[PDB]
Amino acid sequence: MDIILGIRVQDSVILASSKAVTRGISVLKDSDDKTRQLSPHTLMSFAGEAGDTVQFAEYIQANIQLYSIREDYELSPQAVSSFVRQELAKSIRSRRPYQVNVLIGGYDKKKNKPELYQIDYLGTKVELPYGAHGYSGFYTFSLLDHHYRPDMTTEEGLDLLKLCVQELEKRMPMDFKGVIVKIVDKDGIRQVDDFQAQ
Template sequence: MLCLGIWANNFPSWPAYIDDIFFFAWLLELEGRSKADEQPTFNTNERNITNVFSHSKPSRPKPEPQSKCEIPAPRLSARRRCSELIWSAIDREVLLGITGKDFTIIAASKAAMRGATVLKTADDKTRSLNKHTLIAYSGESGDTVQFADYIQANSQLYSMRNETDLSPSGLANFVRGELASSLRSRKPYNVNLLLGGVDPITQKPALYWLDYLASLAPLPYAAHGYAQYYCLSILDKHHHPDITLGQGIKILNLCTDELKRRLPIDFKGMTVKAVTKDGIVDIEFDDDKVVKAA
């Protein structure tokens, strides 16, 4: 309509039936508007058929059917990636922790392994944070040593600055905070920990279970790695809060005997340490004991 009007003004000698042209153009425009109001128009050129006059979101296009014999490549790669994550999450080391009346026992396997290869047969996977707190670690070899040394250095720095030691509870929450910060970084630590000690004020033993996802749980006994599959039932049966240090060592022997009996893997013995009100004590453990088959 606008174009016709401009054209007519520029040409005064336009024929007399120009009024009829304007009239029919106006009728066609009205007819088009009425049809648009009655029946919404659809855009059929695209895959998504959307209502031009409505504000509803377009529906998702349906995926094209695939033949049954074809396996999509992304699904196969995701399945392979999932299996890799599962196998990497399995801890091939042993960590055990037991609390008693006035002590906490921490035990860790001596073998440093990478896959099926034993790299070291006398690896100490424990670190003393202060006089009455001890941690044991497992996981990726580089992450474990670096993270344990970092926690040990910060604990000792706190003791020197404040002339007092952090309690096991305070250290456990500090470690949990560091793991949580690492988990949200580009390169998180793959470390599982057992933190045990005796509170210097209340003289009560404490044991904390931490994993690489920054989970923290205080427990009377705990395990990481293969030990959790075979030893937790033994600890459920024999542990009670008032056991003595000798009874705790006997329960630990039951756990290690079960591991030797059930697993084909040689962990090269156990490093056993106990935390009492007097400090951290190394406990001699018989690694050469022969266990009869079930």
């Protein structure tokens, strides 16, 4: 082990998530989408224990979608992340905790700013210019500490991400089968389906 990275540029948040699903000695799948859209301007990626992962994401998805319809309104990224943190904080002391770590990337319309939150299974939340869960951060935080600028464009961010994915392919012991990359800005969430050989 599941790569989950995030970088916040000037006008968007970019999420990249590995495609592999591995059980034991077999890669069962190489196109896994470790993502749920929570609302048209908020995306969540996740990694952790086998079943908990999707169950948690979908449960969160159901809850935010419920709010949207009740209020005919879209919760801010900050609100969704607080909501998510609290669910994890409760879970950590329950009978069987959710073992899931998440990235939340959102575009806030009230402020017109991208926002990236990193939350681990304990309910530790932080807002970051860039983040990662698992081992991948052991490579990417230092790379980005060097190459990252606050005023990068979306295309600059995608280059910076290409650099991170290169580093991981070179140094990480596991084959994670490339990533799926998603951009979240004012015009919503879109997938860059060309990254495998871009």
